Design a binder for this molecule. Structure first.
Ligand SMILES: OC[C@H]1O[C@@H](O[C@H]2[C@@H](O)[C@H](O)[C@@H](CO)O[C@@H]2O)[C@@H](O)[C@@H](O)[C@@H]1O
Ligand SMILES: OC[C@H]1O[C@@H](O[C@H]2[C@@H](O)[C@H](O)[C@@H](CO)O[C@@H]2O)[C@@H](O)[C@@H](O)[C@@H]1O
Lengths: 301, 310
C-alpha cells in the first residue's frame, strides 16, 4: 500500500545490439548455456505499442548483449525462462488483435534447449501471469493470476510432467492467501526453489496512488507449497532506484516490471527489471529471501 | 461410395498435362530442417526472397516461418536480419503499396492442437507489424487489391468472398459475414484459396488447393492435395475455368513426411516467366518446395497486373 522503502550497492542500464536501435525491455533473467550468458528481451520500437517480438541476445561485454543470429525469434511479449527436469521452459504472452485492436492474449510455453525450443501449450485466455518452478520433490509448481473478472487473485497448483500443463489445470489452481498483497495487482516474474523447500518469488505489483499515479514496483515474497501461506511480502525495487530513462509515455514514469534476481559472489544479488517500458536495468540489493533459505534452483543449461 | 467428384479430373490431368520443366528448391541456414508450403517468391531492394515453413522431418506441428534470400538458381538461405514468425504456411500479397504477410498460428493444450487461426502482418518485408487474426479454425484466408482499389477477401467456412476499404478493417466479423462464391464447379472436394491475382480484365485469377480422402484396396488412406486454379468475377461471385494445374507426381520425387501424404502437393502460387509460361510453386509431401513449368492457367481471361515487387 504505502511502504517506507524510498540500500542499493550499484546499478546499470543494459545495452542491446542487433535490433536496429529498437527498445529492449521486460527481459527474462540472464541464463547460461554452452559456456556463454544469454538473455531474452522484449523488442519494440519506442513509438509503437503492442508491436513486440522476443529475441535471444548473447552477452558480449559488461552490460552489453547482441541478438544471436542463429536463434529463431518469438512473436511474444515479456519473455521468461525457468529450468524444469533438466531442460529450458520458455514462455511469453501471445497477443491476438481484431482489426488492429487487442482482442485476446495468452501465455505460450516452449520446452527444450535454448536454440531448439518447441511450443507445447498455451494458458487460458487473458491470463498473462503464469510462472513455473521445479519443487524440491520434482513436481512442477505453477503460479496463476486470476485478473479477468476485476479480481486480482493468485493461484498455485502442481503437475508431474511439463506436457501436463493445460488450461484446465491452470484454471482450477487453488487460491493462495493473497491478504499480504493488499490492493496490488501482479504476480511472480521468476520463482526460485530455496534450500528450505519453500519458494522465493520475485514479483511485479501495481498500485494506484491517490487523480491517481500508476506505480509498478519490484516485490518479493516466500511461498509455502504445503500450507499456501505467503511470508515476507515486501517492495525490493522501484523505477527511481535504476539509472534515469525517459518512460515510453508519461503514465509509465513509475513503472518497473521486474525480470528476477541473479546471486553475486559477495552474497548480494542483481535485481533485473524492465523500466519505463523502454529499457532493462539492474540494481544491486540485499538477498530478499534471507532467513528462508538460499536459492538452489539454477538457469545453467 | 460417393468417391470425390474431383478424382476423374485429377486422373485426366495426369494423362493430358503439359510440363515444360521442374525443380526442387534447396534451403540453407536451417540446420537441415525441411522447408515446405512456402509463399510465392517476391522481390525487395534488388533481391529475391521467399518465406518458408521450417520443420524437422520427424516433428509434427513444430513449424516456424523464416524469410529466405535467393542465393542462386533454385537455392535460398535464411536471411539472418529478419525476425521469424511462429506460423505455418506463410503467404504474401501486395495491398495499397505494402506487404501483407500471413500464416497459421497454432494453439495447443498439453501438447494437443486445440485451435488455429490466420495471423496478418503488414509493412515492408524486414519490418512487418501484426494487426489482425481471422476466426478460430479458418486457415485459408487470402487478400487481393481489386481493380477499384478495394481489398478482396476469400474465406473458407465452402469458399466466401467480401471486400473492405483498408487493411486495418480486416476483422473476424467481416470475414465471418462473407457471401458464399459459386460452389458448383468445385463439387465435393475439400479446398481453399491460395494466391489471388488481379487480371487485366478486372477478374481475379485464383490459385487454390483441392483434394479428398482416397481409400486404397490394400493400401492405407491418402489425403490427396492437388494444385487448382479458377477465375472469379467479384461483381457476380461467378467462377470460370476451374481446373487442376499440378499434382505431386509432376514434381521431382521426394519421400513424403508420412505415407498418407504420398499424393500431397500443397500449392504456393505462380510466377510469370519471360517465355509467357509460369512457375507453379508448391509444397510437396510436407517435406519440400518445388516448381513445375506450366501453361499460364488464366490464359484467355487477362494478364496478371498485380505484383509482388516490393
Ligand atoms: O505498460 C506497463 C505494463 O503493462 C502491461 O503490458 C502492457 C503492454 O506492455 C502490452 O503490449 C499490452 C498488451 O498485452 O498490455 C498492456 O497494455 C504489462 O504486462 C507489462 O508488459 C508492462 O510493463
Ligand atoms: O498435411 C497436409 C496438409 O494439411 C494441412 O496441415 C496439416 C499440418 O501441416 C498442420 O501442421 C496441422 C495444424 O495446422 O494441420 C494439418 O494436420 C494443411 O494446412 C497443410 O499445412 C498440409 O500440407
Amino acid at each position: 500500500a504505502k511502504e517506507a522503502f524510498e540500500k542499493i550497492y550499484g546499478k546499470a542500464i543494459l545495452s542491446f545490439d542487433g535490433v536496429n536501435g529498437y527498445d529492449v525491455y521486460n527481459c527474462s533473467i540472464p541464463f547460461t548455456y554452452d559456456g556463454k550468458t544469454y538473455i531474452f528481451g522484449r523488442v519494440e520500437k519506442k513509438d509503437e505499442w503492442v508491436h513486440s517480438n522476443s529475441i535471444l541476445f548473447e552477452k558480449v561485454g559488461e552490460n552489453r548483449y547482441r541478438r544471436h543470429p542463429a536463434s529463431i525469434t518469438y512473436n511474444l511479449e515479456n519473455p521468461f525462462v525457468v529450468k524444469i527436469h533438466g531442460e529450458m521452459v520458455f514462455g511469453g504472452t501471445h497477443v491476438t488483435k481484431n482489426g488492429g485492436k487487442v482482442s485476446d492474449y495468452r501465455c505460450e510455453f516452449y520446452h527444450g534447449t535454448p536454440f531448439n525450443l518447441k511450443y507445447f501449450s498455451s494458458g487460458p485466455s487473458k491470463m498473462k501471469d503464469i510462472r513455473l518452478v521445479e519443487l524440491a520433490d520434482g513436481k512442477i509448481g505453477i503460479f496463476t493470476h486470476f485478473r479477468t473478472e476485476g479480481s486480482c487473485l493468485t493461484g498455485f497448483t502442481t503437475i508431474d510432467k511439463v506436457e501436463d500443463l493445460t488450461v484446465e489445470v491452470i484454471n482450477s489452481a487453488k487460491l493462495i492467501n493473497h491478504r499480504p498483497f493488499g490492493d496490488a495487482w501482479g504476480g511472480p516474474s521468476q520463482v526460485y526453489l530455496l534450500s528450505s523447500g519453500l519458494l522465493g518469488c520475485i514479483s511485479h505489483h501495481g498500485y494506484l496512488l491517490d487523480i491517481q499515479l500508476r506505480i509498478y514496483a519490484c516485490t518479493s515474497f516466500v511461498f509455502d507449497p504445503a500450507t499456501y501461506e505467503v511470508y515476507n511480502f515486501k517492495i525490493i525495487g522501484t523505477k527511481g532506484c535504476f539509472p534515469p530513462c525517459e518512460p515510453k509515455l508519461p503514465h509509465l514514469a513509475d513503472c518497473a516490471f521486474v525480470s528476477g534476481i541473479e546471486m553475486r559472489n559477495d552474497g548480494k544479488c542483481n535485481l533485473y527489471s524492465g523500466i519505463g517500458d523502454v529499457a532493462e536495468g539492474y540494481i544491486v540489493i540485499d538477498y530478499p529471501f534471507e532467513g528462508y533459505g538460499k536459492i538452489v534452483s539454477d538457469v545453467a543449461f
